Amino acid sequence: VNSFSGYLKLTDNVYIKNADIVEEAKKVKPTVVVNAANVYLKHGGGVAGALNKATNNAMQVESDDYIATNGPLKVGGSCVLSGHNLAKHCLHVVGPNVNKGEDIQLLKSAYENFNQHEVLLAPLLSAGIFGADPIHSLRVCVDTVRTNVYLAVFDKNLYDKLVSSFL
Numbered sequence: 001v002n003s004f005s006g007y008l009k010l011t012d013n014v015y016i017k018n019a020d021i022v023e024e025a026k027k028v029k030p031t032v033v034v035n036a037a038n039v040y041l042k043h044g045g046g047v048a049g050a051l052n053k054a055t056n057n058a059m060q061v062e063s064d065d066y067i068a069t070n071g072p073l074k075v076g077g078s079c080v081l082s083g084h085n086l087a088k089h090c091l092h093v094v095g096p097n098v099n100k101g102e103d104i105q106l107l108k109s110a111y112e113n114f115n116q117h118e119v120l121l122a123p124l125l126s127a128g129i130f131g132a133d134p135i136h137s138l139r140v141c142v143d144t145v146r147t148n149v150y151l152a153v154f155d156k157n158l159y160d161k162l163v164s165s166f167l
């Protein structure tokens with residue numbers, strides 16, 4: 001039993017809710033919140049900008065030190081950093097950005113990072129400003145992640161479309 005509430009169950013291990021991931025994180029304080037990161041951990045907009053803003057820019061300060069030490073992530077890769085006031089940990093995961101021409105096959109590799117964590121609160125990778133089809137992202141999620149994932153979908157219209165079209 002965990003503290004996630006109001007989710008629709010899609011599969012044995014994937015759950016979904018129309019929610020603001022920032023507000024959801026603030027209330028649940030999950031062990032892991034996933035950020036829709038880029039390879040530079042520049043949290044300017046989308047989910048990343050919202051999560052970073054909610055940390056009063058502490059996520060960005062920590063991220064800049066991480067990059068200065070380690071260099072950029074790989075597309076499809078991840079790193080674990082602090083969850084600040086939102087979660088114990090933040091798993092920064094880089095899905096491919098279609099608006100940069102990145103290979104969508106890397107979306108499966110991106111979701112594989114979730115399997116290193118027993119339970120996660122997450123957005124749909126490569127959705128939103130990353131330009132991928134969220135229905136495709138949900139399919140890859142379900143077919144790749146084996147651990148327990150609670151997906152927060154900000155847009156109510158998209159949430160309804162994702163549920164109604166789910167196979």
Ligand SMILES: O=C(O)[C@H]1CN(c2ncnc3[nH]c4cc(F)ccc4c23)CCC12CCC2
Nearest residue numbers: 021046047050123124127128152153154155
């Ligand atoms: O979920 C969606 O409907 C959109 C938007 N996003 C998010 N997903 C969950 N929580 C969110 N909180 C946010 C606060 C913001 F300022 C901006 C975006 C998000 C956000 C990221 C892109 C997507 C996920 C599927 C396409």
